[PDB]
Design a binder for this molecule. Structure first.
Ligand SMILES: CCCc1nc(C(C)(C)O)c(C(=O)O)n1Cc1ccc(-c2ccccc2-c2nnn[nH]2)cc1
Ligand SMILES: [Cl-]
Length: 463
């Protein structure tokens, strides 16, 4: 087959290495954009501007009411914002405060809409028309759209321009895995799948470095999206996947692509047996994505600085993956997933009840929540591939992944309930994973058996 021909020129070689580094290099900035809203939309302290002010029950001045005389009158005028730590954010620029608390959460929602939208349209287009031709278009779109939001004068312009950047980013991530797996032989088709996560996790460190140097949100937003233009120049000289050319009936160009390598080197829901598994796998993607993005979106509530608390989050992943790796090879994929989920949900519940006065305890069970979900989010993907049959494994993983973003959409929407009850958002934020722990019990497979090529062995393995 094609696998022998790919290894005929030497398999992985000088041509192969130079292609892998270039495509995976922007993945460092890939994770920067997801949590960029955290630093850009930071909310500072503020008090009403007189043309003294009442204080709260804890001894702090109010933020929406002003003394009628030196009755109670709403803050018709603006407010003076702190400049000791945050020179300027979108809250300081546009009045997203008081009666407009929910507006800031809305900006994140449409960002999650853009990434969801880019999975369908671009995925459909990436097969009808050449694969690498989509990658160049996505690279150019994210460079122009990123810099336009840095100069948006009106709030509706900011939301609209951010949505277009979300569509471009989704296609970049999807095409990175598809293009690389085509030119990598099956004998080394798993090493790349582990390097991506390490590069994905290292993105959290880069955001901390740039945030300290550039406090201004207008300059910080520009800096993150600035290098993407540079990657567009290098992306011109790529090589299209040879497997796709033969599939569409374009073999005549396949030989030329192969020759250049040598010189350089030297329907799913149509059967009960699948609908039972799909429903069980459905709640696993949803629950994990719900809790994961519900803890990273806010980190200023705790008593530690935002910069320091971020670097702890980006380094706790390394112990998390090591523990999960040992349990996978010793106890099993299913026992690891269930144990992690029940432990993660319990940790979140205890955080809400515990008072915020003691910061040391508060950050102890807040870091553990991020670390636990990091291990679970890696277990689910590995188990998913082993379960689905080869006929629909490619479609099943994509369908399962395209719904994980649906959980990310709901995550900031539930945060609007803080207006009524401040602790209320934490109640649902940990209740869902615990109820999801009762889904893994009904899964009728485990690990240690040969992979199912056909559906005929699914019932045989059950009995
Ligand atoms: C750390 C974030 C996880 C995540 N976020 C998204 C959003 C931003 C909502 O799109 C998605 C998604 O596209 O569905 N995912 C899935 C994902 C799962 C595992 C991994 C992973 C982690 C460690 C090692 C390997 C992988 C991996 N396996 N397959 N692809 N990546 C990466 C991404
Ligand atoms: Cl993604």
């Amino acid at each position: 087959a094609f696998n022998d021909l790919l290894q005929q020129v030497g398999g992985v070689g000088r041509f192969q290495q130079i292609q892998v580094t270039l495509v995976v290099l922007p993945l460092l900035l890939m994770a920067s954009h997801n949590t960029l809203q955290n630093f850009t939309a930071a909310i500072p302290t503020h008090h009403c501007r007189p043309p003294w002010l009442p204080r709260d029950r804890q001894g702090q001045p109010e933020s929406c009411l002003r003394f009628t005389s030196p009755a109670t009158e709403p803050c018709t005028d603006g407010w003076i914002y702190d400049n000791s730590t945050f020179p300027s954010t979108i809250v300081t620029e546009w009045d997203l405060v008081c009666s407009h608390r929910a507006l800031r959460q809305l900006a994140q929602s449409l960002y999650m809409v853009g990434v969801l939208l880019g999975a369908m349209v671009f995925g459909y287009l990436a097969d009808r028309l050449g694969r690498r031709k989509v990658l160049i278009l996505n690279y150019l779109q994210t460079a122009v759209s990123g810099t336009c939001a840095a100069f948006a004068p009106n709030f509706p312009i900011y939301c609209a321009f951010r949505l277009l950047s979300g569509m471009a980013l989704a296609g970049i991530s999807l095409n990175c895995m598809t293009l690389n797996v085509e030119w990598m032989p099956i004998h080394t088709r798993a090493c790349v799948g582990t390097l991506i996560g390490y590069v994905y996790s290292l993105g959290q460190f880069l955001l901390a470095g740039v945030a300290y140097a550039v406090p201004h949100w207008r300059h910080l937003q520009l800096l993150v999206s600035a290098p993407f233009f540079a990657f567009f120049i290098y992306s011109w000289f790529f090589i299209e996947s040879a497997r796709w050319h033969s599939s569409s009936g374009r073999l005549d160009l396949t030989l030329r692509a192969l020759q250049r390598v040598a010189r350089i080197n030297g329907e799913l829901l149509r059967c009960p047996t699948l609908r039972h598994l799909f429903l069980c796998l459905s709640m696993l993607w949803f629950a994990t994505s719900f809790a994961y993005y519900g803890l990273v979106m806010d980190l200023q509530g705790f008593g530690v600085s935002i910069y320091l608390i971020q670097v702890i989050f980006g380094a706790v992943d390394l112990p998390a993956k090591l523990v999960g790796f040992l349990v996978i090879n010793s106890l099993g994929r299913r026992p690891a997933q269930m144990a992690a989920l029940l432990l993660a949900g319990i940790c979140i519940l205890l955080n809400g009840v515990i008072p915020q006065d003691q910061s040391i305890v508060r950050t102890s069970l807040a870091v553990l929540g991020k670390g636990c979900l990091a291990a679970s989010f890696n277990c689910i993907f590995l188990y998913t591939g082993e379960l689905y049959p080869t006929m629909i494994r490619q479609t099943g993983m994509g369908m399962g992944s395209t719904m994980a973003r649906v959980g990310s959409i709901v995550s900031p929407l539930v945060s609007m309930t803080a207006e009524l009850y401040p602790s209320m958002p934490l109640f649902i934020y940990g209740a869902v994973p615990v109820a999801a722990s009762a889904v893994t019990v009904l899964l009728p497979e485990t690990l240690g058996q040969p992979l199912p090529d056909t559906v005929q062995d699914l019932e045989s393995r059950w009995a």
